[PDB]
Structure 1
Amino acid sequence: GVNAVHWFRKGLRLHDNPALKECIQGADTIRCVYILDGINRWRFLLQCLEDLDANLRKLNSRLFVIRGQPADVFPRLFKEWNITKLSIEYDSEPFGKERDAAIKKLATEAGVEVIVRISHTLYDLDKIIELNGGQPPLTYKRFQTLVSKMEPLEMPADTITSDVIGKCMTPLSDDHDEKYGVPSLEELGFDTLSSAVWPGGETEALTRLERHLERKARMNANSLLASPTGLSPYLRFGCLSCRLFYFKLTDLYKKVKKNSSPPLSLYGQLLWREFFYTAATNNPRFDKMEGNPICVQIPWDKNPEALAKWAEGRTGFPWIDAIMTQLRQEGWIHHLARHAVACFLTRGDLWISWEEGMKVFEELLLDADWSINAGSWMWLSCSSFFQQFFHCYCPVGFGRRTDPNGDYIRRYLPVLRGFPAKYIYDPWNAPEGIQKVAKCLIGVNYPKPMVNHAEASRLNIERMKQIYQQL
């Protein structure tokens, strides 16, 4: 008698799920569980779980959602259900490893075989680190070189279908909706908001992938807005398999461009994601400055007033404030906009730790998990990965060059809708008569800029230089 449990954490999908596929094989019963320990991230999650539950329902099964801590939950589940097999998608993240090692111990005690399969990343990250001699690579270029030395990527596992399940079944009681149902936002305590710009789930992910490949078959102002074929949140939650994406990308290139040796540039989004997971996996202090062996020690200031102005879009720099408003409202911003607000907060203008901007993004950004968010923030503040710090993004000019008309500003900061393009990125320079026509007095209706960028950035660039030896 083989009673199996698959434990969803990431990998919130039925396609390319090797762990769930292996767990079902030879099983007499299967139950899939999700254990629930910023409003936009919670909504996306719950929408992923609703979609998972729906698709399981098509297979005469159901998702089992449980509120609690895994170490306090699984031993009683093992006992009641007489479990002999538990499957998980491998989690490279350091605190995920530690959680999963505790569960593996509990599982062995209960006589439960633990199935673990890699499918959140393109590669076995431990193999990359071994090829590099026991440390992760500290430059992106070195990482790409190592990747080119890996064996060819694993093909996606077969999708879980009725045929796959076979005679394996799921016991269900009439009170499943009450006992094991996906909670609502209200039920978590949220005051609920218009429909999400980024709807969660595998079903959404797969249609987006197709249209993304069709479109793929150049920056501009429109790139700042959420794309209906954007894929990054679905990759972070596991709604979309990165290996399916990679394989589809390769196949399309070969058909369209008649070549079977594509560039590494083709997978740039996927590989930068892989780079940060590799860097993070053996470093439990990856998300800190102090005690983090790869992070340059930089004397950031503590400044809660300034941090709050940045976090809340009240800096008085419209380009910065609009980005942080779009982020709070919708949960995604363009990678160039991340550069802008990360440099402003850290090395550029406010000289505040990347750890504090990381905390804000963790609450708000749909595609930022522990490894990606920490790695990204160290990258953008020039704290690791040998990033260049001699240039500082201009919190007026970069936006003016990205959206010269200023529509993005007017869109996310309606209080500034009345300014002409001439002043939309620097409204403090607008004559009083313009401010009156705009019905926005700078310093009253919209804050004046919190710093003198030319002066602050000049000093911060010199200060960063003087950290290192002069030659």
Structure 2
Amino acid sequence: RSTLVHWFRKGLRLHDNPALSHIFTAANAAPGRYFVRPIFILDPGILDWMQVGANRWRFLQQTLEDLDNQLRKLNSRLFVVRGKPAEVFPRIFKSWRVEMLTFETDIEPYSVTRDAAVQKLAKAEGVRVETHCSHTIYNPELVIAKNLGKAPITYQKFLGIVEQLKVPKVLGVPEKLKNMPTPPKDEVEQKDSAAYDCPTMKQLVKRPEELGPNKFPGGETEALRRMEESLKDEIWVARFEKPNTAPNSLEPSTTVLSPYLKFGCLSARLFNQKLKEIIKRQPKHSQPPVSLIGQLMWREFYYTVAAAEPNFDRMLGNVYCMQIPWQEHPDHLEAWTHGRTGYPFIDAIMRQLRQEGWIHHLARHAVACFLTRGDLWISWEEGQRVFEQLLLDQDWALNAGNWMWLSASAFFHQYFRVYSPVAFGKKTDPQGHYIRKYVPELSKYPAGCIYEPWKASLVDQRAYGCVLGTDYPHRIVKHEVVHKENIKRMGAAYKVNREV
């Protein structure tokens, strides 16, 4: 008796999962011949290459616990194997007599390298590998091909390409396993009945004092429920315009499906279909790029450019990225990283990010503009790395790609338009309710100067119980001075790049 193995990495869902469906149908179409091991590998190598903050460790824990629960309802379970894939797979290929391995493809360089090695090993041991592209709606390889070898570098060109492509068939959940006995204990399972059990919170979250509020639980179960709730107001869905959603409402003004799509707890292909049904129903609706379908297309867009450039996440050797002489300022970077810039709007966003792990898209704009071309002149690679630690949705391609946009390093080139850290939030939060929540030390400043507490006299600062320089920091820079200087720096950078 040989085993069929589905390998979770992303695609942490039962629904719309061709790679996992195939395994299950195979076992049910040939009962008595196959064991089924759905596995997720706790790969220590990922830590040598990426940073993970407490909140995202908890999201994953929650995700794996839900996936194990969902798999039990199909008379299976999640096997969480600890160790490196390069060492893990040779063992289990033998100990399990693995006939077929399926997994969902990924375009990240670490994923490509890892997967190539695993396919070299599987080919040696005579293991059949089947992979499916279901993390995205469109196959970036097919988009690049349809565009004659190059990724489209504008959204509009990208849309024109994928319009001519076939939308994939969205699958249901796999059928339950008919007469599938519990797999036989292997070398590790026999010395430890729990060696493959889902990790506890304690095992995954080493810094539990860094956990913030539990607001967006992980798990395919929570994703589908959050999607169903988001779609309930079909008018809100149909007439959604991303630019008109607020960055600083107390309640998220968008869906907050990003953590679920990032991990694959929600299929983008299912979400796209559900959106296309509502749009059909609602003749007055928005259109890309501002619409909700437009937002899934931005995801597709960035995954397509990123699949063609292994160096997508750095400035050097990145075909898309303007070479810009960012400066090194450790103290300004620390202040930004911990929301101690002295600009309440900027500090409120960064504290929301560290405490909760999600901030609105225009909040990401504000703070990213500040760190890079706006104010501090610090490389987008430094803000990427902070976002990478803190974000529940941390995604290689988007964190990369949107940082390049925001710094005017690629895709976006109107660097003379600069967000004001004082004025930008006022449009949608004149009272500064958001600031009061996330910067509580300023909670007694009136709306007139909560965005600019340095406009309050010392007497008033003491009255509000928050003296700048003691209870809340002075501005680490003067926006009105630096942002003009950075515009000229940017113009010089652009000139140099144009001449090379």
Under TM normalisation by the shorter chain, which class is it? over 0.9
- For the residue of structure 1 that corresponds to 2:98, the secondary structure is coil
**Is 1:201 aligned with 2:228?**
no
User: Cα gap change, 1:103/1:210 in structure 2, threshold over 3 Å: closer, same or farther?
Assistant: same
Distance 1:221 1:340 in 2: 9
User: Cα gap change, 1:248/1:132 in structure 2, threshold over 3 Å: closer, same or farther?
Assistant: same
Match of 1:34 in 2: 40
Distance 2:323 2:165 in 1: 33
Residue in structure 1 matching 2:201, options 157, 166, 185: 185
Please tell me whether the aligned partners of residues 208 and 228 of structure 1 are also in contact (alpha carbons under 8 angstroms). no
Distance 1:456 1:318 in 2: 18
Deviates more, 1:195-204 or 1:448-457: 195-204
User: Cα gap change, 1:250/1:454 in structure 2, threshold over 3 Å: closer, same or farther?
Assistant: same
| 1:353-409, Cα deviation, whole Å (9 max, x unpaired) | 000000000000111211111111111111011332111100000022231101101
Match of 2:275 in 1: 249
Please tell me whether the aligned partners of residues 24 and 168 of structure 1 are also in contact (alpha carbons under 8 angstroms). no
- The residue identity in structure 2 corresponding to 1:101 is A
Match of 2:50 in 1: none
Match of 2:30 in 1: none
| Alignment TM-score, normalising by the size of structure 1 | 0.94
User: Unaligned regions of 5+ residues in structure 1, if any?
Assistant: none
Residue in structure 2 matching 1:211, options 222, 225, 229: 229
- For the residue of structure 2 that corresponds to 1:214, the secondary structure is coil
Distance 1:447 1:263 in 2: 41
Residue in structure 2 matching 1:302, options 316, 328, 340: 328
Alignment of structure 1 residues 92-131 onto 2, 5 Å: 92-131=107-146
| 1:73-116, Cα deviation, whole Å (9 max, x unpaired) | 01101111111110000112222111100001111111110010
Distance 2:412 2:247 in 1: 30
**Is 1:159 aligned with 2:173?**
yes
Distance 2:366 2:322 in 1: 21
| TM-aligned CA deviation for residue 221 of structure 1 | 6.7
Match of 2:65 in 1: 50
Match of 1:398 in 2: 424
Alignment of structure 1 residues 222-237 onto 2, 5 Å: 223=249, 225-226=251-252, 229-237=255-263
**Is 1:267 aligned with 2:299?**
no
Distance 1:172 1:255 in 2: 51
Distance 1:414 1:170 in 2: 54
| TM-aligned CA deviation for residue 222 of structure 1 | 6.0
| Alignment TM-score, normalising by the size of structure 2 | 0.89
| 1:110-166, Cα deviation, whole Å (9 max, x unpaired) | 111001011100011101001111111111221112122222x1121221231xx33
User: Cα gap change, 1:377/1:170 in structure 2, threshold over 3 Å: closer, same or farther?
Assistant: farther
Match of 1:419 in 2: 445
User: Cα gap change, 1:224/1:464 in structure 2, threshold over 3 Å: closer, same or farther?
Assistant: farther
- For the residue of structure 2 that corresponds to 1:291, the secondary structure is coil
- The residue identity in structure 1 corresponding to 2:101 is L
**Is 1:74 aligned with 2:89?**
yes
Deviates more, 1:176-185 or 1:136-145: 176-185
**Is 1:85 aligned with 2:103?**
no
Q: What is the aligned residue count?
A: 467
User: Cα gap change, 1:304/1:245 in structure 2, threshold over 3 Å: closer, same or farther?
Assistant: same
- Percent identity of equivalent pairs: 53
Distance 2:269 2:263 in 1: 14
- For the residue of structure 1 that corresponds to 2:4, the secondary structure is strand
User: Cα gap change, 1:134/1:224 in structure 2, threshold over 3 Å: closer, same or farther?
Assistant: farther
**Is 1:445 aligned with 2:462?**
no
Match of 1:9 in 2: 9
